[PDB]
């Protein structure tokens with residue numbers, strides 16, 4: 001395991017050093033998106049929650065293709081405003097339900113340390 005706690009204040013600095021391999025060691029789901037919502041990284045833990053195969057979703061658009069249930073003001077709406085503002089740090093509960101058993105999760109979205117990338121972190125509640 002990589003020891004990092006969900007919701008940690010300095011999480012973006014810690015994750016900056018991790019490769020896809022290390023990301024797979026986290027205790028929670030982690031997705032990295034570009035400013036358009038394309039998936040740059042997707043870890044094993046997120047795959048465990050959602051059923052998606054991590055290698056098969058990289059390169060696809062999270063909001064349009066992979067996770068249309070997040071296409072709403074409550075999720076996508078918050079992401080887009082964060083991208084526009086260049087600042088994002090929000091935590092909320094949500095239910096993932098597209099092609100899967102409805103699963104309640106806690107979501108934390110945060111701007112990454114690099115210019116135009118964004119993290120989505122996910123854990124069961």
Ligand SMILES: *C(=O)/C=C\c1ccc(O)cc1
Pocket residue numbers: 046050052066067068069070095096097098
């Ligand atoms: C709602 O959340 C719908 C789908 C979904 C699929 C994959 C991932 O990672 C999150 C959400």
